DNA sequence: GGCTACAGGACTC
DNA sequence: CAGGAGTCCTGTAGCC
């Protein structure tokens, strides 16, 4: 199989810079704003002249005001960003109909009906990149392999603007020097398991004894990583169809009340419900991050779609079910709708 | 034992 | 000082 994994550089920076070109050169800090007091939020990514000196996604807008005052400051136009992506998606599609929008950014293209090599894949990513940037003026990050992952490890490698290839001599080489960390679906909590068993690449996973691997890690995780291993992963590129949408909102002080909650529970199921079009849920979940930050959550499914009216009513109880099963304050809270008809 | 629902864990962009 | 949106997996308990 030949995989065509396309990532859309520094996007929602870079989407403001083609609106605004003067911001072109210039650090810019796309930010979402929480409402709790002036700056209070957090950044949702920057271009690279920003990320050059630590300002990345993540960190709150304080602290990246403290490294780059000067640094321009655009609050989050998501729906922007959605219109230009898909638009870009459809550019895609043209080169391949099995295709896989992971995010408003990342695409995989099966190819390996469409050329013969990497020498024509490569030549498939230039022709890619320039269409994109031709129509849209913007710059993308090429990453092509064998199956998902690496095609992705590649662009990983290669970003910004870049297009990259890794063949099957790559992928056993990678195998034996890659950090483990850097595996997509690898994070800090794994990776310190990993690095603890001294598992520090993928070959490790190899040796080690499965249910110890298992243990740690759990059964579908050490599976992947060996399948990888191994250098037998195969997982088909398909669309991705949405399994839940919701909205969460940030309280201007955090609370416990449950009249004081309400109307930012009612607005977050406002605006779910616009987002949700014509998907009827069967399912509703009450999310709340307390204040210490730990996410807890309350559902039911219905036998039935659910109507704002009973979306309404049900987010209530569930709410209280939060509310008198936990004695910690709320911080942000919303709903997540799913199991669609 | 293993399927289902529900709640939390972890991860990704 | 810590936003937002969305996915997949797992432990626990009910049930066949
Ligand atoms: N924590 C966090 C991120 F890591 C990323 N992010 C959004 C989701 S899509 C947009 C992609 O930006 P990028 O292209 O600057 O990310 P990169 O692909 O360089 O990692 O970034 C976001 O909103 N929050
Ligand atoms: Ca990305
Ligand atoms: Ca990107
Ligand atoms: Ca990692």
Redesign the pocket.
């Known amino acids: 199989m030949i995989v065509l994994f396309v990532?859309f550089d520094y996007?929602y920076a870079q989407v403001e810079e083609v609106l605004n070109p003067s911001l072109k050169g210039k650090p810019v800090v796309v930010?979402?704003?929480?409402?709790?007091?002036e700056?209070?939020?957090?950044?949702?990514?920057a271009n690279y002249e920003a990320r050059k000196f630590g300002v990345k996604?993540?960190?709150?807008?304080?602290?990246a005001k403290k490294i780059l005052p000067n640094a321009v400051y655009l609050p989050?136009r998501?729906e922007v960003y959605q219109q230009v992506s898909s638009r870009i998606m459809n550019l895609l599609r043209e080169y391949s109909e099995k295709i896989e929008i992971?995010?408003?950014?990342?695409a995989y293209l099966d190819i390996s009906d469409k050329v013969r090599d990497y020498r024509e894949a490569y030549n498939l990513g230039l022709e890619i990149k320039n269409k994109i940037l031709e129509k849209e003026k913007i710059t993308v990050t090429v990453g092509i392999s064998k199956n998902k992952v690496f095609a992705?490890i590649a662009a990983?490698m290669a970003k910004p603007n870049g297009i990259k290839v890794i063949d099957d001599e790559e992928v056993k080489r990678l195998i034996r020097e890659l950090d483990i960390a850097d595996?997509?679906?690898?994070?800090?909590?794994?990776?310190?398991?990993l690095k603890k068993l001294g598992i520090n690449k993928l070959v490790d996973t190899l040796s080690i004894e499965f249910d110890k691997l298992?243990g740690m890690?759990?059964?579908?995780?050490?599976?992947?990583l060996i399948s990888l291993a191994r250098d037998e992963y195969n997982e088909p590129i398909r669309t991705?169809?949405?399994?839940?949408?919701?909205?969460?909102?940030?309280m201007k002080r955090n609370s416990r009340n449950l009249e004081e909650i309400k109307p930012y529970l009612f607005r977050?199921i406002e605006?779910?419900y616009y987002?949700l079009d014509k998907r009827i849920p069967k399912?509703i979940?009450v999310?709340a991050?307390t204040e210490?930050?730990?996410?807890?959550?309350?559902?039911?499914?219905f036998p039935h779609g659910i109507s704002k009216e009973t979306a309404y009513s049900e987010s209530v109880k569930?709410l209280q079910?939060?509310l008198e099963?936990?004695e910690r304050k709320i911080?942000?809270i919303?709903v997540?709708?799913?199991?669609f008809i």
Do not use: Q, W
Request: aromatic share 6%.
């Open positions: 990532d996007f930010c979402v704003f929480s409402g709790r007091f700056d209070s939020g957090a950044v949702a990514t996604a993540g960190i709150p807008i304080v602290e989050m998501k992971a995010s408003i950014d990342e992705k990983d595996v997509p679906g690898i994070g800090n909590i794994t990776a310190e398991k298992k890690i759990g059964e579908a995780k050490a599976k992947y991705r169809v949405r399994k839940s949408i919701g909205r969460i909102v940030t977050a605006e779910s987002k399912a979940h999310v991050v210490d930050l730990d996410i807890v959550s309350r559902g039911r499914t569930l079910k939060i099963e936990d911080r942000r919303g997540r709708f799913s199991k």
